Symmetry: D2
Subunit: 299 residues, 4 copies
């Protein structure tokens, strides 16, 4: 009820998808037919958000364009017989208002988020951040997360339990103490992509955050961490060490990391199987490919 603007950092290089991402933004990759950024925009609308501050890069024009009307394209589609599609290409743009925020160089997720400071209304008390390459299903974890912030103030992040092998890929929470609800916990530290030996838990940060504006000040104090980037994680950890309250909402359901082929492909399968048109066939197709590989393997 309080969130007006949601910050969607989409200015990365997407190295894990190269060469494809040389000119295609990972954020626009179709989960069946729909980009994760469009998925994120829809979730933000559901949250009541009225604007989307998209952090973008100079060589990623499509990100913002996806949310603008393309009369060239709509016209073409008219004279071809399909108004049905003109609607599909207007959905994102119509869902919410996209406000582009340029990030010249990909200095970090944290640095990206800091860029949106000037863009929020002075009247906004929280910074809602949604990573466009991360899906938390069913949608609504943000509604749960806001409830927790109302109750405890401070910042709140969404977490998922992860396998020992996936811990190095995420921001990992250091649990401080449990809470009235088993799915809400207070945290004592946050660490970005730790070696498996030095990971405080198996609780990993998904791309959902409801942060206290204090973050911006914490982001100006932080120095570069993992991979030489200015990490949102490190600023959250800063706030933690200062005494600011930071809780996690532990998500029980489906989570899809669209950020690399390993998570993206299964996401396409997942959504592909429930699709009214492709469902049946995909299943058959995939079962045969799985079998083909099993055979290959033994041989």
């Amino acid at each position: 009820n309080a969130v007006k603007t949601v910050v969607v950092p989409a200015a990365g290089l997407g190295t894990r998808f190269l060469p494809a991402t040389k000119t295609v933004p990972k954020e626009l990759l179709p989960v069946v037919d729909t980009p994760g950024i469009e998925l994120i925009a829809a979730e933000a609308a559901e949250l009541g958000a009225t604007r989307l501050a998209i952090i973008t890069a100079p060589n990623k024009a499509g990100v913002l364009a996806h949310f603008e009307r393309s009369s060239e394209l709509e016209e073409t589609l008219m004279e071809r017989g399909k108004t049905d599609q003109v609607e599909i290409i207007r959905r994102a743009a119509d869902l919410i208002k996209a406000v582009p925020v340029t990030q010249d160089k990909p200095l970090g997720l944290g640095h990206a988020v800091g860029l949106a400071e000037s863009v929020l209304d002075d009247d906004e008390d929280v910074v809602a951040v949604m990573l466009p390459d991360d899906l938390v299903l069913p949608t609504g974890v943000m509604e749960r997360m806001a409830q927790v912030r109302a109750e405890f103030g401070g910042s709140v992040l969404c977490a998922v339990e992860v396998s020992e092998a996936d811990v190095s890929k995420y921001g990992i929470f250091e649990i401080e103490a449990d809470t009235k609800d088993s799915d809400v916990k207070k945290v004592k530290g946050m660490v970005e992509k730790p070696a498996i030996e030095d990971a405080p838990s198996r609780l990993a940060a998904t791309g959902r955050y409801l942060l206290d504006r204090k973050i911006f000040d914490a982001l100006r104090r932080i120095t570069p961490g993992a991979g030489g980037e200015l990490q949102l994680t490190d600023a959250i950890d800063l706030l933690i060490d200062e005494g600011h309250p930071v809780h996690i909402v532990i998500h029980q359901g489906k989570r899809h990391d669209l950020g690399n082929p390993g998570g993206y492909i299964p996401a396409c399968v997942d959504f592909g199987l429930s699709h009214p048109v492709y469902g049946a066939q995909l299943k058959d197709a995939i079962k045969q490919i799985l079998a083909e590989h099993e055979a290959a393997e033994r041989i």
Copy 2:
């Protein structure tokens, strides 16, 4: 036999992937991490082609750019010393030289091929066409098609047997007779996307063509067909009727149609399972997803 130019029609709307394709060309979608265009480019270079005539559209600039140096991106990956990443994004340009050919409006695949006429060297004997959303594996069918052409002269296409389910999506051949070779059949007609009841065979046209320069002539005499588009198939069918010799090489191996989600997903799964980095985890993830779907469908 001496192919110099290979025509790669990459100017369509990609309706099947909308809304993602609003700004992203389907030809650039990652099969794991590599666009189908880059794979076709590799298949063309393998054939000994030296140049790629990419029919592109005004709104699809990424297609050409994928084949040209990306200064700022290499400079960004350099700072970080992502050396392997720099080579990755140079690969396409190193494979073959891309020549853009604009098709202002998606008048059909036939029309697109027709725009390549002027681009070819006058010394060029055939019109080699490789559709960028269709993988025929392993690469080499084009070499076999050239042998067939050297022998019977005339025009040659590549066919794969397809289920009734896939019939209406492809160009289907009308068989005349079995020839000298088991894999080669002489064709007496071609129909674009027939209904199942109308399909003269189960042999569908793969996007691989070695056409006699006479198609240009033929392409100017056809009228719109399926979709109100100017179909290449319709021109070939025209030549056949005017007694031009047309043969098909029937591909026995794997074939992936990347042109739509139904075929793109499984291609991704198929290449993904063979991937050194993603293989194992994909296998488990997809098994789990299949199993979750089973339970859901019961529950």
Copy 3:
């Protein structure tokens, strides 16, 4: 009559390099307004409802000028200029026709064939780097065509130093109307010696659809380019009637600095905001030059 007007704008603009490295010469301001926009209202004035703009892959700006600037519009109101920027797009419907390589004016014009409606019987071409003032020659030209049928071009007298920059006519017969002559020849950029006259073609043509067939019969000429002049000449050589309407009024070649600069001065002097100051500024700059030359 005219429904569509062909505006070739896919050239390289080498005379303005290095500026034209990214800027289309067709977009340079005549004070504040691009020549293409000036051609667009001349087109609209005539009746045309479509503008077939021949463009190049790297001149996205050309068409964009006739498209909406939502991004830019949202920035403007915030602080009477949004009026100004919506102008060109509201004057007429731009239809982009891509010409991948600049093979020639003649080649560029040929690309429009497939774009003109079937019921269309004239090929109206207006070069966007050439101003014929006041607007309306095309109304005149159209009259000459209603009478004589055939193809009509607009000319203006020019001088030896400036003869080699244009398409030059070979006069056949004077005529009734002092300003309408029949032509028996047309040569592109003839050396000073060769010019069959001093009557040069401006960028205004009303051509019979036959120009399309003629364009397929010619070979490269003057600059290794497929010259529209050459196809016109072929049509002449074969008995197709071709007449020129001679413009006695003002004309500006915005296609090169020597022509663009004076065009800016001309419109600038009549400017309600800038006129007075420009006048003073230029008069002093001239004076400084005069002095510099002697001194």
Copy 4:
């Protein structure tokens, strides 16, 4: 000087509708854009980088300083060897570094964006506005001398007519120096009404600023036109006792930011062109005469 900051992220409203897609900084002065003249000026002073403040809808600004593989090839085809070098000049002269200004919040704002782009080595913020020509080039060399001998901040002014005060930052003079061309300043006002102008000395777009403007730029409130004015920040620095001196340029100065200054600039350079010179003189004189008679 290592980095010259060049603010080119403006709307260029004065040249609309043309500037809808064309950056005003790219308009040819005959055939050379102001940004290229400014780049040549920066190079002459020894700068190796140009930090260009650019806007999302002005890609050409930066493209102008990059190699056009597609255009160079097309020109090689027609064998135009000179032209290739012509389109390479800018790019060869200096390294362009883009800095994006999403919205045109002001010249001061724009300048602020270049902070994190300067090296620590660098003691000064050299700013050259690409729509203003101070001729002949070299005023910055002079301004440097002045800074060396007074420390602090240095601007370049030109005497201007009453008619033109409102278009510029106008200085309030405080005192003279050993040199008649150098004055210490006591205030700066952006675009004052005629009655309100404290001098007839206008700021040209040349600055050698102490690194303290960054700090000041964060502090000033928007000023004239709703913008964060660089002038207001320089004034703030004045108001807190920081030393600011102006080199008064006695020579030629061409304001290319609006049609009134741009047209005359083109005439002036055109009259000197070995190719267009003579013909322009004649064409212009003739046009003036027609206007007379009209």
